[PDB]
Amino acid sequence: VKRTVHRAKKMSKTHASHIINAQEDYKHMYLSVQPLDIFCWGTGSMCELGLGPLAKNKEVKRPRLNPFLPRDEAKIISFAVGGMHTLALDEESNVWSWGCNDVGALGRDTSNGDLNELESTPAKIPRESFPPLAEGHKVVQLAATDNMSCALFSNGEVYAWGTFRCNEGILGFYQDKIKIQKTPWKVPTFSKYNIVQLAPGKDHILFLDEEGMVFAWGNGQQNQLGRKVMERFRLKTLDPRPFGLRHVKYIASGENHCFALTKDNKLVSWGLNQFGQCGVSEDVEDGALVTKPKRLALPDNVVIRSIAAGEHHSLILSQDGDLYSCGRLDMFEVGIPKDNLPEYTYKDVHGKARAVPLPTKLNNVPKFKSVAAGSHHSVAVAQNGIAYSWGFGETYAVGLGPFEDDTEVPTRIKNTATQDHNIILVGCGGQFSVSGGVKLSDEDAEKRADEMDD
Amino acid sequence: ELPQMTQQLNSDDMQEQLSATVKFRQILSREHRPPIDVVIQAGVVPRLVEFMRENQPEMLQLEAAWALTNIASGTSAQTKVVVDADAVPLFIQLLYTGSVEVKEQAIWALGNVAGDSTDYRDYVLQCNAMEPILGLFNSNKPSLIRTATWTLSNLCRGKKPQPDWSVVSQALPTLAKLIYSMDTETLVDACWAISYLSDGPQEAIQAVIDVRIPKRLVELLSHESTLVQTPALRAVGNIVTGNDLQTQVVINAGVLPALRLLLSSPKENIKKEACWTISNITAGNTEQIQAVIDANLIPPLVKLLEVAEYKTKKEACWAISNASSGGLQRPDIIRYLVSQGCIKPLCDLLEIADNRIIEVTLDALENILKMGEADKEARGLNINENADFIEKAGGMEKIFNCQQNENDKIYEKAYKIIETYF
């Protein structure tokens, strides 16, 4: 009677249009997969250690478990260490905070031993301060500079507080409209795409979107912002702005120098290069400033995994486990012994080696899986899960014990608190350090002890 | 890199598991030639499905289901690896436990599985995937409902062994809302899923029409591009395959002024499937023919019956031939048809068409002649003039030359109507 009478069935999930990066490519670097025991060491003269107000806890020379961040109930998953303060989010996406709050970098109220109990003890930032949390979103990365904090959300929104500091006094927080931001604040969108990664410095912070564009925000006296700022239009242009850096997969920043990894596996750096920390030129008397991004000459088989840098040194961690360092030698930041100094080390007018201005692979060291760098000290965990710190040690930031001499070579951190632990995340500040990890099973610690101390 | 990635994937450090699972997902997410067999050969598939267990952390489940998604997107043999790892139930479990991210991730993998063949489509339905999938349509992100609608399109799909009407008919109330979306990519998948379901016995055609759907299907007959006009036209096309109380409802939503808009569409398949729809609505009540009469649909159809191609003239003939069938109750349907210039395109169709169209064209020319037989008896005439202009267009010669074809039914009719009127 009545008569009854192409489109794809399968479909791979790939990148869409101009998108180079996805947030999932980054959160494995920052957010731990399981709650961590938090360990702090160094000097907490400015409440950095987060171990309480008692003066006994102001100076800790070996990694000490932080009871204010218990693994069972606080459940700290990630943490970002600034210069005098740190942030940390838990398993329910609540950011913690402890450190110096002279410029509101802690995002919480402080008013009403020697240390301030509110500053020297970690506590949560009010959840109501983050509207995205109430809208069903999570924090995928935290960042902390010297005087400014920042939180990246899973929807691409960015919240930040604190200030940036110029060399003279206080520069400002955002575009002449606000001097100091005490509470978490919504950074207005500055890109058609969502931000995927943060890279904090001393008084600046970088951004990176899915498109691959890099943005800069903060102080730019040392050309950290990838451009130049005149005195007149300084506050008017103080906001996350690009600078001709496109097609970038990964960003990382020292205190006044930055790095960016492009899609074609090309690593460029810019900013301040006082001690060759950018690793771009062999002559250190030549350029104190790298205005235009300059490519680093790493070996061919190298695939960059992470990049950590401090004030005058940089550490490039490869996927094969090798660690490449470049920068200042005056406090053994690069971790290269005096007998293994390469040909291109810089001797000053007095004849003393001052820096290594090119990326140099460390030798006689274990394979590393992560690395962090403070102002003049560094921490890198090996493949088994043991930390190796080196550099400036007069503040016990290397956590190697009661001695004040600098350490020339990455040496093992060994104390009862950390020996049975596999540490996952490590951060470093000005004169302290923070590590987080999980305790191994009694048999997993049995084998590793047989591997090392035999 | 693979020997390193495989070794890092099997390490007991869960964080190293996550970093390795990200690397596998990245190389499996390349746009061209993803190394699916090379990672299948690597023996890491049974561990990827291990990372989707209930106890596993969410970041690990996300990267694992994403990597397995792109493995299932390949050859029908490469999808067999994912299903023989017993991964489909874990995909459905993550539709309950995990967050929005993993739910969008697993609904993508289930879509590639359910779209490979009909046995995998039933297998997905076999594991009670319908209830969690339909529950995903209360979320907010337009991409989640985009991937979920596409998977739901592959579920209503397949006709050689049709999907279980019981487990699939639960989705129409959810599809009735998805047509009202504005995302162009979602509603296209939503319309195709409806056209797949509107095809079947009356248990389905009555079900589609009982859930408020066909009113907007005519509203989406008018859309910008043709990517949505085609599934919606197929949807309203399968609805008229039912009884005449079912076709009567589509007529209410102004379907006929919308069908004329499609009769001049740039895409030819929109022209043809419009004529196929106009064909079946002209096969109901004699008043349903009048609906097509007054709707000004026949002037463009008779010109299609002349200049358009055979794939479209055939369905245009069925529309015109079924229209003349209403002359028993109301002989003026032919009276309206003869004035539009219908006898010449029908007669010129005699030599170019085939056994199945010469049949219906003769039925049209006969019911035209049968009306004129009643015109020369009730009205005073002594010659039937419905045959006067058949040969004015050269049709009496062609129908006389239709007695030579050896098909039984066309020789029995061409010879009968030529003796009855000539």
Author numbering:
A (entry chain A): 2 to 6, 16 to 122, 141 to 482
B (entry chain B): 88 to 509
What do the paper's sentences say?
Unlike humans that express seven isoforms of importin α, Saccharomyces cerevisiae has only one importin α gene encoding Kap60. To determine how Kap60 binds the yeast homolog of mammalian RCC1 (Prp20p, herein referred to as yRCC1), we co-expressed the two proteins in bacteria, purified a homogeneous 1:1 complex and obtained large orthorhombic crystals of the Kap60:yRCC1 complex, which diffracted X-rays to high resolution. Difference maps revealed strong electron density at the N terminus of the β-propeller, which allowed us to model yRCC1 residues at the major and minor NLS-binding sites of Kap60 (residues 41–47 and 3–6, respectively). Unexpectedly, in the yeast complex the β-propeller is positioned onto the surface of Arms 1–2 of Kap60, making the complex more elongated and slender than the human counterpart (~135 vs. ~115 Å). First, at the minor NLS-binding pocket, yRCC1 residues K3 and R4 make close contacts at positions P1′ and P2′ of Kap60. The NLS major box of yRCC1 is unusual (17-RAKKMSK-23), lacking basic residues at both P3 and P4, but with R17 at position P−1 that makes a strong bidentate contact with D276. Third, a ‘loop-helix’ motif (residues 24–46) lies immediately C-terminal of the yRCC1 major NLS box and connects it to the first β-strand of the β-propeller (residues 47–51). While the loop (residues 24–32) makes no contacts with Kap60, the short α-helix (residues 33–40) packs against helixes B of Arms 1–2, sandwiched between the yRCC1 β-propeller and the concave groove of Kap60. The α-helix in yRCC1 is not present in human RCC1, where the linker is 13 residues shorter than in yeast. Mutations in this motif did not destabilize yRCC1 binding to Kap60, suggesting it functions like a “spacer” rather than a binding determinant, used to position the β-propeller onto the N terminus of Kap60 and avoid steric clashes with the Arm-core.
Eukaryotic cells maintain an intracellular gradient of the small GTPase Ran that is predominantly bound to GTP in the nucleus and GDP in the cytoplasm. This gradient is generated by the asymmetric distribution of Ran effectors: the guanine exchange factor RCC1 (regulator of chromatin condensation 1) is sequestered in the nucleus bound to chromatin, while the GTPase-activating protein specific for Ran, RanGAP, and various accessory Ran-binding proteins (RanBPs) reside in the cytoplasm. The association between importin α and β is mediated by the N-terminal importin β-binding (IBB) domain10 of importin α, which also binds NLS cargos via a C-terminal helical core composed of 10 Armadillo repeats (the ‘Arm-core’). Two NLS-binding pockets known as ‘major’ and ‘minor’ have been identified on the concave surface of importin α, spanning Arm repeats 2–4 and 6–8, respectively.
